[PDB]
């Protein structure tokens, strides 16, 4: 999991600012990383298995959209 740590602190700060957040605990960084992983896991799973369902080898924006609709409902 050296990759989730590649999601940087400044990125997390920008995201929080965009959300209206004036200040954060230093503990927010891992919290956020953990939330992002779970999101991406749910959505990517649906995306690729959909691509596979369609007998394709390239994940398309329409595959991602299918997965967003699924996770949306859920």
């Amino acid at each position: 999991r050296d990759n989730i740590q590649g999601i940087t602190k400044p990125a997390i700060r920008r995201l929080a600012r965009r959300g209206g957040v004036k200040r954060i605990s230093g503990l927010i960084y891992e919290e956020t990383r953990g939330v992002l992983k779970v999101f991406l896991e749910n959505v990517i799973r649906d995306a690729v298995t959909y691509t596979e369902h369609a007998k394709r080898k390239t994940v398309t924006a329409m595959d991602v959209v299918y997965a967003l609709k699924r996770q949306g409902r859920t």
């Binding site: 990759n3 989730i4 590649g6 999601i7 940087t8 990125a11 920008r14 995201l15 929080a16 965009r18 959300g19 209206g20 957040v21 004036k22 200040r23 954060i24 605990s25 503990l27 927010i28 919290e31 956020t32 939330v35 992002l36 992983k37 999101f39 991406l40 896991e41 959505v43 990517i44 799973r45 995306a47 690729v48 298995t49 691509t51 596979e52 080898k57 390239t58 994940v59 398309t60 924006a61 595959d63 991602v64 959209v65 967003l68 859920t74």
Partner: protein, 82 residues
């Protein structure tokens, strides 16, 4: 518009993606990667908004993990009751 760097993000998406594809890396439309990233950012920004309302409600201006944790549980109730 995008807030996360695309490269680190796509490495993560690739890492996650491979678990479902028998150790074979499926390729991605550039637009699939952007769709995914925009959607993740929208999600996190929404979560931050929700979390921060709880911060302000506690009488604070500093966001803590407990505020985030709590905003997740509330989204879960919204999703489950409505």
């Amino acid at each position: 518009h995008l807030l996360i760097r695309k490269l680190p993000f796509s490495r993560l998406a690739r890492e996650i993606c491979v678990k479902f594809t028998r150790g074979v890396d499926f390729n991605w439309q550039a637009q699939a990667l952007l769709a995914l990233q925009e959607a993740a950012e929208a999600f996190l920004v929404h979560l931050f908004e929700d979390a921060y309302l709880l911060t302000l409600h506690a009488g604070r201006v500093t966001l803590f993990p407990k505020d985030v944790q709590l905003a997740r549980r509330i989204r879960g109730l919204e999703e489950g009751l409505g």
